[PDB]
Amino acid sequence: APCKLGCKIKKVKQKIKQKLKAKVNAVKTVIGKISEHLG
Ligand SMILES: [Cl-]
Ligand SMILES: [Cl-]
Structure with a gap:
């Protein structure tokens, strides 16, 4: 473990x-949810 x-x-x-x-x-997931049109 030589992590300096x-x-x-x-x-x-x-x-x-x-x-x-x-x-x-x-x-971004939530942006995707609202970018869905109804139906
Ligand atoms: Cl942080
Ligand atoms: Cl991204």
Whole structure:
């Protein structure tokens, strides 16, 4: 496990990116729901 500071910064960035992407995905899903025409 030779993960030094540059490596640690990457881990943190990826965690944040991952969470924010899930939020976007959540929001886009809902955009899709309302973009449906009735019937
Ligand atoms: Cl975050
Ligand atoms: Cl996307």
